[PDB]
Design a binder for this molecule. Structure first.
Ligand SMILES: Nc1nc2c(ncn2[C@@H]2O[C@H](COP(=O)(O)OP(=O)(O)O)[C@@H](O)[C@H]2O)c(=O)[nH]1
Ligand SMILES: [Mg+2]
Lengths: 859, 174
């Protein structure tokens, strides 16, 4: 194969419009690298330097070779290294490397960049072995100030790639100081911004690699001096990269930072924070976040290791005088445009202010609250919005006494801001109120403040959708925090709140998620509803059932993809509320269960039901549990959905399907007879299914217990099959030796118990039916006696000792007396009556088993 | 045929929901099963804007290493990207910096959205507060559910706005 044909393969892999031509070429490339790597490696290197090949193909040539040299998977990493080392001849290795260094200096940057990745990959394999010993000299020489711009840049980029890629060091030699080469490229004596960028980025990539260098004061002082100069460069991208390096250095080499923070770093980061350039201020905010984040992390580590030689220098704490006021000022650089959702310097400032509050707690209060007091009634909306943002930003960190106190002072003025002309003030106010609810809900006096908070939220729901959304979120916090208070004051406001939320849920669209959040809030209202507010739950269910109805009588054939997907988002929203209603107030929907099941079946009948099927299955299952006998009218038409669910033996849905069988057996009680034959034959095939997920086996074995206990003598035809499944299960050993594999055998064994308890309860009036299996049941009881993981569970022993008793009661004619004179049985009963290990209920059942066992021997 | 279109590469760990997100946008179908993508699948998604249609030729890439195919080779000529992770799975979030790095080494300056998928699931392990990825110029974060359709269009509206240079571009009813 020739260079040109191989280039054609590369190009077609990614450039051909025909998707089958792409696959075919991709497959042939992989086949080549497999069959003849030596050739594939050479050819790739030749296409990378060939002027006649399209750019995209040359880049791919470098990338694809690289991806056969290096890998995320460390097993393939070793195979790739060994395949390069052993299958590629010295001559071929030399040509390939030579071609890579030639691409590196290409006048096309994107070729050079991809060459750098290829060089790093080769270097990862060879440098540990002291192969390629010429490389380090070549890279250092290439970065000399007098070399052409493109050569310096591409070589700094390659050095960086090479360093972040070398194994947790341990390979790192003297001639050619790599640190000096990189730091020099960052010097202000470099005319070329592209080269300084490349240098500062290479330096960042190399910080872990140059650890020993960083631990020599001389080299470290020099590096810090150059990086600090760089922050003061004219060019904004060079500044960014300089602060980028500072952040990384602070977080890796914190331990060496005190002298520089004191000499010059401190004063410059403070000055840069006031920059009228937004991007420049962000950079410096970033640095102070990193500092805060570190010191928070150090404090956690020091608590867990108090004798640690590590010391916090408390930079953030010392800086409050200076940093906090500057952060606060940055809060007034908000974006004018309500439709812009990008991160900006004011958000960086808020985030950092919150870290300061967490780090420094109460020490943050004075400067923040001076600011809030000064700005909460300022004439400019920017100052009013910064005020509430600052206040909400310190609702986590300071102690509960201080927060509670200042909330009491601020809250009236905060609530009054919900009437602001400014959208952004209202949006942040609703958010702030939310923060107060989330972290300090007891600060909201039930008498003085809660009525105002509720009113604020109600106004908010009717305002701009962005404000409304935050109000829905704030209501959720209010309710989650205040529903658990013992004299609980929030239920006084449920009707008002539910009414506001319904109104928000009735919005015509979901601009800024105003509608979706209203539905989440409604779900919360339902979740936390008590009996005193039952009427408002009914409102919610009536509202969403009606809304679900609307969504299904839309003109399906004229709906665009965009329309349909919005509609389906709303149906998902609706179902979340209906699930909550059914879980919490199953009684407040059973008067209309008939129309609810009507909607559910219609939903399921549509094709494109996949997104909502499971939700609806869950909902119906939980509703079935509440209706009991009243759900039998829906069983016939629910049947194929149940069966579909039972057969997805790999999905969590099948577990709940089994649970459903258990529920209607328990509710139909004797009437479950009608369905028992179909149910049993399906459960039988699920349990002997190889692909059934692990949880099914025991779920099934337990539900045999349920059915048998509800169905009495009507279980007898299944008795023989089920007993064989139980015997087989009880003799299965753990699949291996792990905790996991043992816990699962026991889960199975606990399910056999459930089966036998249920069957014995069921065949109470029919002992002849149980008689042939008494031996097998006792074989099981013997395992319970033997395994600590079974017998030491109070519930399991009480059930086991109960079987001993209950079976004895069933045969007063002496036909099974032989099982009751065994040593192991007597000792098990004694043990179950003995220590402190088992509870009174368990001991009383052992007492009874003991009495029945005694009666047997005298027969 | 000439049209306003952009190559978008979709990357992220296996299982995070990349292929499911694309199919819903493409056909409206929610895929329940996990069928790992082999290498890449390419599909065009068309959005109607107030400046007419925008097309995203979405390269839906394999997230499992075993099935990666051309890997970062697929990024060649990308004009934007989405990185996905699963809000329910911390490991997929901790691999985001590496997917990010792999992208920027091939596409120096492109707009990128980080999508935290599967927010419909009860307990998230990655809270939306603690995300810092979107703090820079050509980077953005959204919570998303391919299943509840929460924030369904946002990644594409944000990308379109950046690529066209119009901050007030809207997705209009065609
Ligand atoms: N609950 C939920 N499941 C999802 C979501 N997105 C995807 N999934 C499921 O997660 C799995 C992800 O599969 P897939 O899209 O092929 O992952 P990929 O490898 O990233 O392409 C599938 O079973 C999907 O049904 C979501 O937003 N919510
Ligand atoms: Mg996929």
């Amino acid at each position: 194969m020739s260079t040109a044909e191989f280039a054609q393969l590369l190009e077609n892999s990614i450039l051909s419009p025909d998707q089958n031509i792409r696959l075919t070429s991709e497959t042939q490339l992989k086949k080549l690298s497999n069959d003849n790597f030596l050739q594939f490696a050479g050819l790739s290197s030749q296409v990378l330097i060939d002027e006649n090949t399209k750019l995209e193909g040359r880049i791919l040539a470098a990338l694809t070779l690289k991806n056969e040299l290096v890998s995320k998977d460390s097993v393939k990493t070793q195979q790739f290294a060994q395949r390069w080392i052993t299958q590629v001849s010295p001559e071929a290795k030399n040509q390939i490397k030579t071609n890579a260094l030639t691409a590196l200096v290409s006048i096309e940057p994107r070729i050079a960049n991809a060459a750098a990745q290829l060089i790093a990959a080769i270097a990862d394999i060879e440098l540990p072995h002291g192969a390629w010993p010429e490389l380090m000299k070549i890279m250092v020489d290439n970065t000399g100030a007098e070399q052409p711009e493109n050569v310096k840049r591409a070589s700094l980029l390659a050095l960086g790639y090479m360093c972040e890629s070398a194994d947790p060091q341990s390979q790192v030699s003297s001639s050619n100081n790599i640190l000096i080469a990189i730091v020099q490229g960052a010097q202000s004596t470099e005319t070329s911004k592209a080269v300084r960028l490349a240098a500062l980025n290479a330096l960042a990539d190399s910080l872990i690699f140059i650890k020993n260098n960083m631990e020599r004061e001389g080299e470290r002082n020099y590096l810090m001096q150059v990086v600090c100069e760089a922050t003061q460069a004219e060019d904004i991208e060079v500044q960014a990269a300089a602060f980028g390096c500072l952040c990384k250095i602070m977080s890796k080499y914190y331990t060496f930072m005190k002298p520089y923070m004191e000499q010059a770093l401190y004063a410059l980061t403070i000055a840069t924070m006031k920059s009228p350039n937004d991007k420049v201020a962000s950079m410096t905010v970033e640095f102070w976040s990193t500092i805060c984040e570190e010191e928070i992390d150090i404090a956690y580590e020091l608590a867990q290791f108090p004798q640690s030689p590590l010391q916090s220098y408390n930079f953030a704490l010392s800086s409050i005088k200076d940093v906090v006021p500057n952060l606060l000022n940055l809060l007034t650089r908000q974006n004018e445009d309500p439709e812009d959702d990008d991160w900006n310097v004011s958000m960086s400032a808020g985030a950092c202010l919150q870290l300061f509050a967490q780090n420094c707690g109460n020490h943050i209060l004075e400067p923040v609250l001076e600011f809030v007091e000064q700005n909460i009634t300022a004439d400019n909306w920017r100052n009013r919005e910064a005020a509430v943002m600052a206040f909400g930003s310190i609702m986590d960190g300071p102690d509960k006494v201080q927060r509670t106190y200042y909330v009491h002072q601020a809250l009236p003025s905060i609530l009054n801001l919900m009437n602001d002309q400014s959208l952004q003030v209202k949006e942040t106010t609703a958010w702030c109120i939310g923060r107060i609810a989330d972290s300090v809900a007891e600060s909201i006096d039930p008498q003085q403040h809660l009525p105002g908070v509720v009113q604020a939220c109600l106004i908010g729901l009717q305002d701009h959708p962005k404000v409304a959304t935050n109000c829905s979120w704030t209501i959720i916090n209010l309710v989650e925090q205040l529903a658990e208070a013992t004299p609980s004051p929030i239920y006084n406001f449920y009707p008002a709140l539910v009414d506001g939320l319904i109104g928000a849920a009735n919005r015509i669209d979901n601009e800024f998620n105003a509608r979706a959040s209203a539905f989440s809030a409604l779900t919360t209202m339902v979740e936390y509803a008590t009996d005193t507010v039952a009427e408002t739950s009914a409102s919610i269910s009536t509202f969403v059932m009606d809304k679900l109805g609307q969504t299904m009588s839309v003109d399906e054939n004229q709906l665009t993809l965009e329309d349909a997907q919005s509609l389906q988002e709303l149906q998902s929203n609706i179902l979340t509320v209906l699930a909550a209603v059914i879980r919490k107030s199953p009684s407040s929907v059973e008067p209309v269960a008939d129309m609810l099941m009507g909607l559910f079946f219609r939903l399921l009948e549509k094709k494109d039901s996949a997104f909502i099927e499971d939700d609806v299955f869950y909902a119906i299952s939980a509703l079935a549990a509440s209706l009991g006998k009243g759900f039998e009218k829906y069983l016939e038409t629910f049947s194929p959905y149940l069966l579909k669910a039972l057969n997805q033996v790999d999905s969590p849905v099948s577990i709940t399907a089994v649970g459903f069988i258990a529920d209607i057996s328990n509710s139909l009680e004797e009437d479950f007879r009608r369905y028992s034959d179909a149910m049993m034959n399906v459960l039988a095939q699920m349990i002997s299914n190889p692909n059934a997920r692990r949880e099914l086996k025991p779920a099934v074995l337990s539900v045999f217990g349920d059915i048998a206990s509800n169905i009495g003598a009507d279980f007898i035809p299944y008795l023989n099959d089920i007993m064989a499944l139980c015997v087989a299960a009880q003799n299965t050993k753990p699949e291996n030796g792990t905790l996991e594999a043992l816990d699962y055998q026991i889960k199975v064994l606990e399910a056999v118990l459930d089966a036998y308890v249920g069957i014995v309860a069921g065949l109470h009036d029919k002992p002849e039916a149980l008689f042939p299996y008494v031996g097998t049941i006792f074989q099981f009881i013997a395992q319970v006696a033997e395994d600590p993981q079974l017998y030491s569970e109070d519930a399991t022993s009480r059930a086991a000792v109960g079987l001993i008793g209950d079976i004895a009661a069933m045969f007063p004619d002496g036909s099974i007396k032989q099982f009751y004179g065994q040593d192991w049985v007597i000792d098990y009963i004694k043990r179950t009556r003995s220590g402190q290990l088992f509870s009174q209920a368990t001991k009383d059942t052992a007492r009874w088993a003991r009495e029945q066992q005694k009666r047997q021997l005298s027969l | 045929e000439p049209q306003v279109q952009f190559k978008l590469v979709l990357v992220g760990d296996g299982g995070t929901g990349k292929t499911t997100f694309v199919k819903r946008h493409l056909t409206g179908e929610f895929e329940k099963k996990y069928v790992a993508t082999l290498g890449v699948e390419v599909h065009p998604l068309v959005f109607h804007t107030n400046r007419g249609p925008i097309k995203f030729n979405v390269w839906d890439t394999a997230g499992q290493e075993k099935f990666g195919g051309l890997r970062d080779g697929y990024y060649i000529q990308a004009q934007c990207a989405i990185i996905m992770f699963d809000v329910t799975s911390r490991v997929t979030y901790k691999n985001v910096p590496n997917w990010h790095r792999d992208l920027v080494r091939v596409c120096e300056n492109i707009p990128i959205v980080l999508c935290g998928n599967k927010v419909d699931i009860k307990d998230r392990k990655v809270k939306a507060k603690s995300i810092v990825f979107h703090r820079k110029k050509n980077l953005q974060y959204y919570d998303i559910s391919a299943k509840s359709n929460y924030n369904f269009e946002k990644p594409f509206l944000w990308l379109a706005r950046k690529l066209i240079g119009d901050p007030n571009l809207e997705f209009v009813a065609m």
